Amino acid sequence: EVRTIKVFTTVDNINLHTQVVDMSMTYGQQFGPTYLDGADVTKIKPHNSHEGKTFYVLPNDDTLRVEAFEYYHTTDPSFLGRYMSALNHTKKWKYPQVNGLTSIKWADNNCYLATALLTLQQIELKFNPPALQDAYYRARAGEAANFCALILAYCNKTVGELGDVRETMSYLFQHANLDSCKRVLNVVCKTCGQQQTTLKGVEAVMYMGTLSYEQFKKGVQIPCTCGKQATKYLVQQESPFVMMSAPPAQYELKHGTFTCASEYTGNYQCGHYKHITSKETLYCIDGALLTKSSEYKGPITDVFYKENSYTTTIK
Amino acid sequence: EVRTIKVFTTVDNINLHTQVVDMSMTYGQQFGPTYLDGADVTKIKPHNSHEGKTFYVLPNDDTLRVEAFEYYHTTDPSFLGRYMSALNHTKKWKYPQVNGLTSIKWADNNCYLATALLTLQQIELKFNPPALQDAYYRARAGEAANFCALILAYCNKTVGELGDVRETMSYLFQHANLDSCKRVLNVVCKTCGQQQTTLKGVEAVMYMGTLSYEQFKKGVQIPCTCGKQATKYLVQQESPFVMMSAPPAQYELKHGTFTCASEYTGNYQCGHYKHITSKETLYCIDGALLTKSSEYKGPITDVFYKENSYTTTIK
Numbered sequence: 087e088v089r090t091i092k093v094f095t096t097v098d099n100i101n102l103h104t105q106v107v108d109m110s111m112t113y114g115q116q117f118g119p120t121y122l123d124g125a126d127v128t129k130i131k132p133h134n135s136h137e138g139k140t141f142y143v144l145p146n147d148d149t150l151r152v153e154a155f156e157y158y159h160t161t162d163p164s165f166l167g168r169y170m171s172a173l174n175h176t177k178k179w180k181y182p183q184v185n186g187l188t189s190i191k192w193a194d195n196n197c198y199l200a201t202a203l204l205t206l207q208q209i210e211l212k213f214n215p216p217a218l219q220d221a222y223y224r225a226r227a228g229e230a231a232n233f234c235a236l237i238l239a240y241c242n243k244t245v246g247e248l249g250d251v252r253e254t255m256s257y258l259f260q261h262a263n264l265d266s267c268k269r270v271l272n273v274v275c276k277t278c279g280q281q282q283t284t285l286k287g288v289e290a291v292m293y294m295g296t297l298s299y300e301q302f303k304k305g306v307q308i309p310c311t312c313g314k315q316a317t318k319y320l321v322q323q324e325s326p327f328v329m330m331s332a333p334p335a336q337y338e339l340k341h342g343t344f345t346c347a348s349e350y351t352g353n354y355q356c357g358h359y360k361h362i363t364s365k366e367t368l369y370c371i372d373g374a375l376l377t378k379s380s381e382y383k384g385p386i387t388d389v390f391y392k393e394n395s396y397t398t399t400i401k
Numbered sequence: 402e403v404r405t406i407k408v409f410t411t412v413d414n415i416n417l418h419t420q421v422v423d424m425s426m427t428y429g430q431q432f433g434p435t436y437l438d439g440a441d442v443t444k445i446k447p448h449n450s451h452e453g454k455t456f457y458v459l460p461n462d463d464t465l466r467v468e469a470f471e472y473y474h475t476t477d478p479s480f481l482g483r484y485m486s487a488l489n490h491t492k493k494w495k496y497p498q499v500n501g502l503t504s505i506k507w508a509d510n511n512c513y514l515a516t517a518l519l520t521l522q523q524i525e526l527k528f529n530p531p532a533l534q535d536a537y538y539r540a541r542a543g544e545a546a547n548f549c550a551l552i553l554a555y556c557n558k559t560v561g562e563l564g565d566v567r568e569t570m571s572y573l574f575q576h577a578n579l580d581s582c583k584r585v586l587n588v589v590c591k592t593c594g595q596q597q598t599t600l601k602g603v604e605a606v607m608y609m610g611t612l613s614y615e616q617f618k619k620g621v622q623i624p625c626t627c628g629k630q631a632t633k634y635l636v637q638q639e640s641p642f643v644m645m646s647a648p649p650a651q652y653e654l655k656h657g658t659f660t661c662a663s664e665y666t667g668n669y670q671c672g673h674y675k676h677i678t679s680k681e682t683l684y685c686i687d688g689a690l691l692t693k694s695s696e697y698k699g700p701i702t703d704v705f706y707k708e709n710s711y712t713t714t715i716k
């Protein structure tokens with residue numbers, strides 16, 4: 087006696103594909119790797135409660151490969167299995183509202199993700215992949231499980247792995263529309279003279295070497311090929327924010343001089359991030375935890391600043 | 402009795418750091434994770450033959466974090482351990498010269514890497530990270546082990562994993578200077594009218610949906626939000642190449658009409674890439690293998706074309 091149920095398959099959870107499945111065969115025998123809201127059901131036979139439900143599958147025909155690429159903007163063949171694996175964990179995380187922002191309760195070394203998510207909610211940024219658009223909208227409303235699982239997938243991080251905020255923001259910026267952003271730098275060597283550089287997109291809003299946007303505008307010392315120290319300074323900036331990053335160092339954050347920042351305590355093998363936001367006072371958001379202070383000093387690794395248009399007065 | 406040797410530590414294999422190591426303690430007890438030309442020596446005690454040798458370590462102080470970021474352009478904390486793990490394998494791969502290009506002898510599902518490397522040698526592209534500049538220069542001369550291990554690290558792929566050429570090229574392009582590249586598209590819906598789009602950088606040279614650069618210039622059918630099919634066509638192109646990608650489909654490559662292409666045989670779970678180059682005839686490079694033909698038809702997934710400046714005659 088042959089028994090079947092109707093189910094839907096999908097890659098994007100919007101475009102459904104009708105399937106009739108034999109209840110005597112695993113999902114894996116019929117579709118390949120199959121997932122039900124993050125749970126791997128590849129080795130499970132259909133249940134009556136599955137009738138009418140949506141399962142994710144891998145893009146195993148041309149229709150699904152086009153739907154997957156258009157939604158996620160990747161053709162990495164392990165992407166959907168990494169997104170599903172992460173989602174099976176992130177759907178059980180808690181996303182409390184802390185000082186008006188979606189945060190994440192600490193679990194599975196997710197501190198870098200909490201500070202990234204809190205940061206995104208304070209800067210002007212629009213994603214390009216529909217998957218990130220749709221999930222980020224949900225995350226802002228407080229249901230951030232899909233958004234967090236997609237960040238893990240896009241970054242090639244598994245739940246529990248130690249992440250870097252700067253690296254995470256770089257991946258998210260690579261999937262954002264930053265095409266309007268432009269940076270002009272000048273590098274002055276007393277031996278080699280001057281060299282100007284123009285940067286665009288992600289490389290226009292990120293700098294690694296100093297936390298201070300004012301110091302970047304006055305000049306920072308860097309090696310020259312000739313062996314002297316050259317001075318690099320900001321000639322021109324067009325962007326709605328900038329991100330200044332550095333290896334973690336004791337640094338003073340003053341109310342009203344920055345938007346938000348990331349603090350890292352620990353070492354290269356394990357540590358903990360916290361988020362500092364400058365509002366009516368300085369709030370320190372640590373997952374679900376919140377404290378406040380008029381002054382802040384800590385091992386800061388990233389600082390975000392508001393921008394629109396800057397032009398140097400250095401001739 | 403306390404015995405020591407001098408060794409050097411590094412993150413970039415250029416900047417050396419003098420160390421004195423106790424021969425009674427593992428490298429791991431003294432430096433953390435340590436590698437000798439890709440081999441993990443973390444759990445090994447120093448040998449006399451190690452005196453004067455360079456070991457890679459993880460960026461565990463501010464000097465190393467700056468050297469690592471400046472050389473690799475990443476702050477992913479697992480990067481160097483992934484680069485070292487891959488290199489331990491790639492240094493044993495063979496890199497034959499095939500029709501004047503560095504290829505790779507098949508091993509560990511590396512076909513996607515061989516076709517990517519052959520492609521890079523046929524298109525005008527300069528990398529931004531010194532690590533890729535230096536390794537790509539070595540790869541062009543025939544010593545591609547570092548370059549292949551860095552592609553694996555930057556792509557978050559391990560040796561043996563099934564890769565996608567389009568995805569791999571996207572990661573390499575993200576680390577290349579494509580800031581001059583510009584694409585203007587027009588999307589025409591008989592219901593919604595016209596919408597023009599400008600793309601920059603990587604998104605100016607990559608398109609997913611059609612293999613044909615001529616079809617892209619005449620127009621390709623895509624969904625509109627209103628439910629009709631719209632026509633997307635190329636208004637303007639400034640770049641030294643373009644890459645046209647699609648799910649694998651039988652396709653005819655004609656001598657003199659393209660630069661090179663990737664062919665994929667198999668399915669979403671496992672397959673094999675080959676490279677087709679258009680020179681004095683059509684050469685099919687399959688790792689170490691070479692064949693030739695006047696005509697070619699196969700399941701093509703990517704085609705590369707030469708460009709400088711294009712302007713449509715569609716009004």
Ligand SMILES: COC(=O)c1ccc(O)c(O)c1
Pocket residue numbers: 155156159214604609
């Ligand atoms: C990275 O991939 C893309 O940028 C991309 C792919 C498909 C689209 O429809 C689109 O608007 C952008």
Ligand SMILES: COC(=O)c1ccc(O)c(O)c1
Pocket residue numbers: 289294470471474529
């Ligand atoms: C992605 O990171 C960068 O683009 C970057 C980082 C350091 C540099 O000295 C540089 O010229 C570029």
Ligand SMILES: [Cl-]
Pocket residue numbers: 211212213218219222
């Ligand atoms: Cl968005």
Ligand SMILES: [Cl-]
Pocket residue numbers: 526527528533534537
């Ligand atoms: Cl280069």
Ligand SMILES: [Zn+2]
Pocket residue numbers: 275276277278279310311312313314316
């Ligand atoms: Zn100089």
Ligand SMILES: [Zn+2]
Pocket residue numbers: 590591592593594625626627628629631
């Ligand atoms: Zn329309």
